[PDB]
Write a protein that binds this ligand. Structure first.
Ligand SMILES: C[C@@H]1N[C@H](CNC(=O)CCc2c[nH]c3ccccc23)[C@@H](O)[C@H](O)[C@@H]1O
Ligand SMILES: C[C@@H]1N[C@H](CNC(=O)CCc2c[nH]c3ccccc23)[C@@H](O)[C@H](O)[C@@H]1O
Ligand SMILES: C[C@@H]1N[C@H](CNC(=O)CCc2c[nH]c3ccccc23)[C@@H](O)[C@H](O)[C@@H]1O
Ligand SMILES: C[C@@H]1N[C@H](CNC(=O)CCc2c[nH]c3ccccc23)[C@@H](O)[C@H](O)[C@@H]1O
Lengths: 441, 441, 441, 441
């Protein structure tokens, strides 16, 4: 099997299904979904961190914001719900009246996602499964139902892989002071041995009850429980070798790394498996304030996915559900948009590998991304060029045959100097959707 | 802010209010106050430690003594309350029927104390605030009241600073064997991780509920929780920079050091801020056995305070209240005595700093202590000399002007050799109270 | 006293009573005794460990076996009790209806045991004393009685020493996955800080409530609680210097080492005090499947005891009681057999010490073991030789006088070369029981 | 770039060149090559370790064996060199008079090897480069030449990759006692801070002087120096990203695992990149006592390489040169035979990947091994079947087209039941060399 030690765990690497998958759905759903409110300030990495917690665009961070008197959230809360209204009271209002996990799994499958990962416990400590280590869970409060297990059955029934998100680094049920500055994160944590046991038992429980395909931890792991992971990871891998874990544990082992909005985004091939995550908007949890102005457009999403895939990554796109379990129309439509694109071009995404390079551009300034499948080379343009004459800068090919992807039509090309020229018959160009895609063999 | 690490915490030093304060009241009040009984054996540091726990003069140590069969306390307990009478039963008898925190704060202010610090939890583990981590507290038992919070409101309303005493190193609710020898202290402790979390959460709770001006720990901090202090101290300092902590945590940081009775008392300037603590008698908790024979006399107290202050310290004089919340007459009168002296001579104590030297004496053997305030030098005699001719040994002055403190009267002096001679007109001498005080400018 | 540190604890060594004792009774009694079933596969150390947990001969391991679907135990359980029948349900069926601790102590004393040690808590976590740290104990469930305390009173009343067995390394009340391979033991453990506190408090409790003569730990001590032993061992030794601990804590200190079936058995003098343990059969807990085919025969037992004693050890023979508290006839008879032998030859066992060598044999192949008592040398044959002429190989004696043990009869001997010859008059030989024993002076 | 900590080093994985190389040459050459002597007892993993160090088949362990008095090596030394001839004296005999690195590089290339790894310093502590950290090296002694350096130029000129072997775990220049049993290894080591520094500094120096392609450490890394490896690996990877390190350091990071003779040899696909190492005979260092009986045949070597390769490993075949720098005829001839088979079947070995499974066998028991290149599946028979009808037990194929690798000839086949049947005309079977190779698309 695997032995509880880093040298040994190192023998386990990102499983094939995950590398081949390329696209997954993240779900931040919780009692924060009820107030479903945040100031849509901007993207993490571009909003200054001395103001970020005070005008937090992450709506799942509502309680932390609510603990900061006079901050937009405090303002909003008191005026909408009042002061005699504690954050926890939202667990009772959290009723998932319209929820149907099969509908969700159908939606994510249609969107082309090959795996799904919900928040089983977010920073506020509310648990979406009937854990036996707390009564602040979806079985005893609000939904009166094992959201995690029920969704796992649906997803798996649809043929998708199922993972779990857990906030091991933060649990506000163990702290009183909110996070006001990034520096606060170094001391405002549970900090106790009790919390380390708790996190450990809760993840062991998720493993025993649902044997997830991915262990997606967040905000690091309690310093006192770090050595525990040697055991937990061995326990997990020995019951499920195709399982996997991310890089937010702060220990030697991890199967694939992560990046959030701008934070840790690679500009070129990074050299290890990784995964990109972001919201359809600026929040993970639902934000009734966000208008389309804040969300990506189907095209941006397709471009986001290609840039990610060309660099060896998986896109973990987040969906932010309403307290009643429905998925906001704006998010549903973009998901489908993406699903439509993937239905046409999926063969140049799923099962692919990185090429010698990820990137290129045309004389005219259109960005190009590359992907490979044995001897095939997908050339994906982030847009559809206007003219039939395309000039790719700094690129030569020895392939000899270059087809227009969707139609299969052999095309004319030649390496003119340090560039590459191809003529893409407008009949064909007009045929593509959001991306001109060519296959070089 | 401050970062959770020793290098960083080092940036925080004893706040000015504390250095300027010079005098505070300690309060050891608890269910031990009910039996209010101890053998007044002698002072810590002069009674031999192979007999000390067997005839403990610290009445707040009643339960530890009671656990030693056949020891004066066992003897006394069985004959007064009987064997079917567990120590814990005192939490029910602890009713504070006559307690009025405003009266206390009035008394301490009149006594000239600038800060007050009660035991929130002593070695027996009984808590004087409605902590949420145990039901063995004053809110659920006996007083049916938040003694800590109510006293903090009173003290602060009187304009005094408020601190907290916590027995982090010992809690007998987690041990069964009593301490019989000083060696027992190295292994007879809670010792568990559970206790370390407990202590941590309880002090965090005191910080969140009352934001004390001083964190006065006792008997060291649980070895498993030591690293926790980096976080707790940063958390505390970041919510309250003028706060402070003592030196009984056993970690790198501390704001001022401590000394108890003879233990760690400095003979001369120590070179860091420190604080002296002792009972009006030989016990901290009330001891109905102590007669005036065991207590200091107003004069001794005044001398104690001057010796302390001259050496850069603060005197933390303990008051040992009765189970019914009243302050025993013997202690009240001495407190007032001291208050009277401070009303006359306070200007040569509060706000002062140490001088080149702390000490001197006269040809006749009267001890002299020094204190400074910019260009002024207070010369405080521990007594009032008989003759108008005073000879101070081994002292010269370049000041040129030396006034009799209370009256302001310029006096005649000259440096005769290696000594200093001053003539203090008996009109003036007769005017002083417990101390002849001169001001040199 | 003893200080909580290894250097200091080292000052404590195996007490005299224990070295002089030579024989003790082990008792594995628990709710596992109810199903009282195991496949009698063979001896630990000879059955291959890749099959051992799947056909475990240790019946007290029933629950671990029951957690392995389709294993003889699963098979058996479902067919006898059914699937809707959890292992814990056995705590209710565990009623000790026929139990009489005085009868037990009488039996063990008659068997010649000088000390007794029951399992207070085995791997399944069920406790046989009214611990205050769990309700899964004999006081709240099944027997409705403090088995540990009641047995300690009986044993001590019979004049025997009393010890305690505790499963510190394993507690299945904190794990879900069974042990399938020896490798699983390195990660399938409680692993939490909570468990370390628990084990610590439970052993401290056994010490405070019964002050055992031996602390017999099993399966190592929780890694997070190892440093705790410095304190626990000092606490124990300071209340009971004649107490003792075994070697299954995984820390620097231990008073005597252990060996189980073939595991760690010494072939010759080891050089430190140790103790041998095994079942009358192949299991510790009762196994209604075992027939005499699986048990040792009185003679084998006597030989087992002599081989152990000659090598400086104590034999800790286990008795496996029924759920109703009675001792199975097969075990009772062997115990008595042994008791009978010890009544005749005890003087060449109790109070003895090892000699220059432990072993020898005759020209004919009869094994011989040696033991000492000052100037006396017991020569114990594992059998009774046929002829009056005995030839011991590779042995000479300078003693001059060699008596036939039981009768006292001086015998004729001489050192012929590298061997030793003695003539044992058949009158005498016919007089011995399972062993020819000679005394050389 | 890479940072100095396990988590970041995790990002580095086995370089593509290494994974594709499949075959390398190990060279154990040292002053131990002069005596060039050993008892050819057997293969590691097959010889009992209670005898192993006493009849050591690893001629490079000569000094260790010489230290064990009365051992075949000791007897042999005294008669050949004399009792007054210290092992270190061999450094003066080690002259490499007939050495020609280009000649070696060539032989290795003609042999089919893609990288070479020489012992820069084996257990005896003598270094084959002008290290500045010791005078016991080839520059100041014996050859008065930088063997490591000159060999690196030559191997690289031949266009092969160059790695280094280093004995971090052992250095007999720091010990006096010999290794007698595996156990001895737990304490007979340098053990000093000094040695940990020596080792770090020397590998650093190897990295600076030669930037090797592989850092192949042996016998673990000194405990006191383990943390230095985070720094050394980061430094190394930052200077040479495509470099690699083995698994014998005893720390979390490694790019590929190792197996030695029987020790750690995978029965099937292991899940990680590894490499098999062994001598052509039973020794790494040259052994004049080995005749062909002790060596592999060209066929066995081929089978070896195929089996290793089909399981995702590399074969690191050892060559043991003579003190004069020549390669023994027996060894050279085996290398060349392997080179010829690879010249012929290289395509089914180099740059391949594992397939669904590594193994299969014919109805009549010929072992079959698999490899792949994109859609091409190579089918390697360890030997050439006598008849034209071949039956592969338990293998069905979907490919529709199965050619004869050497010729390209399309062959007739059909999945019959759970086996696969194929007709290979004898004209082709008569053309293969040691293996019948089929190609399935
Ligand atoms: C997927 C998202 N992960 C967030 C945690 N993010 C990180 O640790 C990424 C880097 C980062 C540094 N400081 C931060 C403050 C807030 C959010 C992210 C970060 C969570 O705070 C958020 O609720 C959501 O679950
Ligand atoms: C202010 C007083 N502090 C005491 C603890 N004192 C100390 O740690 C000072 C030094 C000392 C060493 N061994 C001791 C035993 C008993 C009391 C004091 C000490 C407490 O035991 C006592 O109840 C009271 O709260
Ligand atoms: C006296 C017996 N001790 C056993 C634990 N034994 C040991 O740790 C000895 C060595 C050993 C190694 N692996 C094992 C697996 C099962 C039992 C023993 C061992 C227990 O498992 C058993 O229930 C019984 O209490
Ligand atoms: C390539 C070879 N590596 C050997 C070290 N091998 C190992 O550490 C793994 C196999 C092994 C385990 N215990 C051993 C004891 C002696 C030799 C080998 C081993 C070296 O001892 C040998 O000189 C040669 O360099």
């Amino acid at each position: 099997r695997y032995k509880p030690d880093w040298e040994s765990l190192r023998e386990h690497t990102v499983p094939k299904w995950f590398d081949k998958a390329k696209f997954g759905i993240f779900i931040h759903w919780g009692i924060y979904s009820v107030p479903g409110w945040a100031t849509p300030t901007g993207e993490l990495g571009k909003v200054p961190m001395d103001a970020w917690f005070f005008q937090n665009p992450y709506a799942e961070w509502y309680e932390n914001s609510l603990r900061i008197k006079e901050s937009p959230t405090w303002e909003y809360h008191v005026k909408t719900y009042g002061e005699n209204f504690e954050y926890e009271k939202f667990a009772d209002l959290f009723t998932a009246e319209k929820w149907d996990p099969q509908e969700w799994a159908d939606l994510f499958k249609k969107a082309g996602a090959k795996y799904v990962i919900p928040t089983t416990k977010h920073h506020d400590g509310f648990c979406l499964w009937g854990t036996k280590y707390t009564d602040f869970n979806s079985v005893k409060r609000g939904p009166k139902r094992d959201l995690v297990g029920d969704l796992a059955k649906a997803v798996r029934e649809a043929g998708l892989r199922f993972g779990v998100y857990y906030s091991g680094g933060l649990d506000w049920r163990f702290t009183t002071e909110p996070i006001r500055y990034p520096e606060d994160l170094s001391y405002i944590r549970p900090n106790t041995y009790e919390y380390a046991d708790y996190a450990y038992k809760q993840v062991m429980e998720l493993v025993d009850l649902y044997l997830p395909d991915v262990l997606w931890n967040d905000m690091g792991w309690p310093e006192k429980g770090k050595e525990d992971l040697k055991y937990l990871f061995a326990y997990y891998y020995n019951k499920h070798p195709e399982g996997s874990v991310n890089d937010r544990w702060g220990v030697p082992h991890w199967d694939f790394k992560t990046a959030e909005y701008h934070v840790n985004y690679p500009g070129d091939l990074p050299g290890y498996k990784w995964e990109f995550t972001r919201g359809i908007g600026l929040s993970f949890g639902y934000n009734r304030n966000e208008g389309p102005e804040h969300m990506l457009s189907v095209e941006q999403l397709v471009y986001t996915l290609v840039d990610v895939v060309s660099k060896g990554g998986n896109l973990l796109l987040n969906v932010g559900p309403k307290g009643d379990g429905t998925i906001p129309d704006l998010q549903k439509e973009r998901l489908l948009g993406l699903g439509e694109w993937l239905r046409k071009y999926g063969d140049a995404i799923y099962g692919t590998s990185v090429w010698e390079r990820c990137c290129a551009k045309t004389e005219d300034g259109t960005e190009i991304r590359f992907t490979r499948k044995c001897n095939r080379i997908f050339v994906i343009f982030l847009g559809i060029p206007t003219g039939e004459k395309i000039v790719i800068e700094d690129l030569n090919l020895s392939a000899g045959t270059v087809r227009h992807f969707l139609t299969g039509e052999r095309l004319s090309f030649k390496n003119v100097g340090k560039n590459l020229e191809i003529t893409v018959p407008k009949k064909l160009l007009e045929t593509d959707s959001i991306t001109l895609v060519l296959e070089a063999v």
